[PDB]
Structure 1
Amino acid sequence: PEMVRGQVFDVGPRYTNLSYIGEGAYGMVCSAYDNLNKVRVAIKKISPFEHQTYCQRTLREIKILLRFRHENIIGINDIIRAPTIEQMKDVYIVQDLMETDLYKLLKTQHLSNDHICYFLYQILRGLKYIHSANVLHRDLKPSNLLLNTTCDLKICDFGLARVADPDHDHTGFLTEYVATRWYRAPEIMLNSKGYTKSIDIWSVGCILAEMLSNRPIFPGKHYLDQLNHILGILGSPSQEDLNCIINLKARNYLLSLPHKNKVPWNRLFPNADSKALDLLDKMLTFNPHKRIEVEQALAHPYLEQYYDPSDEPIAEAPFKFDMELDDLPKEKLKELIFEETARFQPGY
């Protein structure tokens, strides 16, 4: 069985002449040649079975990617694992090979206004499909946007995704959270569990800001510093926005801060297109109820060259309830993984 820089990477016979691409907390990524389809592919080795949290993440991502089918969301082409639950220790997920991700591209390339427009259009086209299936991604960020050599963009990484549950979104002040700090909406820090669609629109607004300047807009170093960063640019929230925060601890914290005025986006991004800044402002709205939703953003004048709602499809089959994964022991989650991957086994 083939090896790759340290650990075994066992995907023959079909996938051959492999090459290292990257690591994880509990897997690794290589490219490989696909002998049936005669193309190179990406293969992610996942070893999650020792750890309940990992099993959850892996199950969630497999179940979601297998039921989604959209041009701007990464598909699973194949899944390689042992034929029995006893012998299954690792799972390999085969996907289209993407040239790069938006994080890597932005460390070295300036994007033209045309590219920023086209990438934003594709991110919102894919997000329309995701929200239409009642799913929230929760971890949108440049490293989770894959790009190929012709600038097709696919959203990936649904490890933290959840079914939307707006009725149960409210929580206390400074409650712990999982997703990537620089792209987290202000309400996550204040009074939200991140169970509504508006948290993904905030992360897209942070990604747009980062495409315009090649630097994260709110690069907080930690938890309430992230909010300081936000308020330093957006200004103090209005009375109407604070009246929407009933939790006294979060309300009082905001009232304790010195007043700050808005820094105009054109002061921050003097080369940006004025239409892009108008859309940025609407995605980076403090009040999640006033923040633009995905279909409104697709309709914004900035995207008028690409906008066509008949070519912006929605899901056939929404998730009604969350995967009951809290919750399940490792052993049950391994069995659901084995079951969800069965369709890829020889014969069948």
Structure 2
Amino acid sequence: PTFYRQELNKTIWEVPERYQNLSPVGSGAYGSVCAAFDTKTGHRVAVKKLSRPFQSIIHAKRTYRELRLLKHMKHENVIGLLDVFTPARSLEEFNDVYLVTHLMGADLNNIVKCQKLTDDHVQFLIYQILRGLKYIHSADIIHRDLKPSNLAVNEDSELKILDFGLRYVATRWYRAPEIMLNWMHYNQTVDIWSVGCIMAELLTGRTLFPGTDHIDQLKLILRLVGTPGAELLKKISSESARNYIQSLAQMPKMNFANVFIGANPLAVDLLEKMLVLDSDKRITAAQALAHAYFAQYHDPDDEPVADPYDQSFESRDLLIDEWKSLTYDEVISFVPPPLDQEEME
């Protein structure tokens, strides 16, 4: 294929002639993204150029990690790969990686910002997040930083999770307490806490826990969910942190019906099951999909799990050129999916 060069975001992109009319649509994880027209299919795509993919073993392994993950993801609510390309003609020339997916014009902040959503629409948005999470969680992949800006949405409110599983000042308002505060154990339900925070904000138009720092955010959380038991302290390494929490004036759990006034009582019930401090008592994604709040959308035949995903590489320290060669292998072996991968139920 013939490549062409274009300066985008102050740097040269080199892309196959297949992709035309590139226009910047923002940064992504370790890279920047342009929308483009795929002349082969007439589809609109998003092309991510990785920034310095092989600068160090940290960059090189994260490049491999991202390509492996995206090659594995085949779910309608999860970002996956239409194409992956490099201008390099051989491994010796290989220093640039571009990833291609379907174009999603907005993030979730674009959906709720200027639109009072209906409850039926909120149901659909949260349902899609949970379906995507069921899939990634089934492959032992956790997001860990799920938030509105990591949910890509198209013109018809179809949503995909991105930037999951990936060892600048980010918002912490949606992070699970066990992540934000570096507690000693956590599971896949870290992402369910984030869903609760997202859903609360879609229903009320207000950030649920807009803390100015980690301590202020914890205080806002405890005012809603109540002071934790001694059992929860088991998970916290720092004595100063445990002593502080234990020292706080005790607060009762709020009745969520008094917090989310006017909301669908089924929404309030689901929120009560998601926004619990004990990650072992938090509802899972698969359980949440069965909740009556989503009754009009739920379809067990269309909520699939993932194929087994081999993450053995995560425990390995390899040399930079080994990660580079493995990444090159994954670029070369990529098989684009069929354009139409779905059939009427």
Same fold (TM over 0.5): yes
- Aligned to 1:86, the other structure's residue is in SS state helix
- CA distances 1:43-96 after superposition (whole Å, capped 9, x unpaired): 111122214333333322211111121111111100111232332222111110
CA distance in 2, matches of 1:25, 1:297: 28
Q: How far 1:121 sits from its partner (Å)? A: 0.8
Contact 1:49 1:89 in 2 (8 A): yes
Q: How far 1:34 sits from its partner (Å)? A: 0.6
- Aligned to 2:61, the other structure's residue is in SS state helix
Relative to structure 1, is the Cα distance of residues 45 and 242 closer, same or farther in structure 2, using a 3 angstrom cutoff? closer
Contact 2:184 2:236 in 1 (8 A): no
* Residue number in structure 2 paired with 1:60: 65
Residues paired across the two proteins, number? 328
Contact 2:135 2:304 in 1 (8 A): yes
Relative to structure 1, is the Cα distance of residues 26 and 289 closer, same or farther in structure 2, using a 3 angstrom cutoff? closer
Q: How far 1:329 sits from its partner (Å)? A: 4.1
* Residue number in structure 1 paired with 2:81: 76
The one-letter code sitting in structure 1 at the alignment partner of 2:129 is I
* Residue number in structure 2 paired with 1:263: 254
- Aligned to 1:115, the other structure's residue is in SS state helix
* Residue number in structure 1 paired with 2:341: none
Contact 1:184 1:203 in 2 (8 A): yes
Q: TM-score when scaled to structure 1?
A: 0.85
Contact 1:191 1:245 in 2 (8 A): no
Aligned-residue sequence identity (percent) comes to 48
Q: How far 1:5 sits from its partner (Å)? A: 4.4
* Residue number in structure 2 paired with 1:102: 108
Q: How far 1:117 sits from its partner (Å)? A: 0.2
* Residue number in structure 1 paired with 2:324: 334
Q: How far 1:32 sits from its partner (Å)? A: 0.9
Residue range with higher mean Cα deviation, 131-140 or 45-54: 45-54
Relative to structure 1, is the Cα distance of residues 138 and 14 closer, same or farther in structure 2, using a 3 angstrom cutoff? same
CA distance in 2, matches of 1:5, 1:135: 31
Contact 2:177 2:218 in 1 (8 A): yes
- Unaligned runs of 5+ residues in structure 2 are 337-345
- Aligned to 2:22, the other structure's residue is in SS state strand
Q: How far 1:191 sits from its partner (Å)? A: 5.8
Contact 2:192 2:285 in 1 (8 A): yes
* Residue number in structure 2 paired with 1:343: 333
Contact 2:184 2:235 in 1 (8 A): no
- Aligned to 1:2, the other structure's residue is in SS state strand
Residue range with higher mean Cα deviation, 87-96 or 265-274: 265-274
Q: How far 1:9 sits from its partner (Å)? A: 1.8
Relative to structure 1, is the Cα distance of residues 257 and 195 closer, same or farther in structure 2, using a 3 angstrom cutoff? closer
The alignment's C-alpha RMSD in Å is 2.5
CA distance in 1, matches of 2:225, 2:96: 46
CA distance in 2, matches of 1:257, 1:54: 42
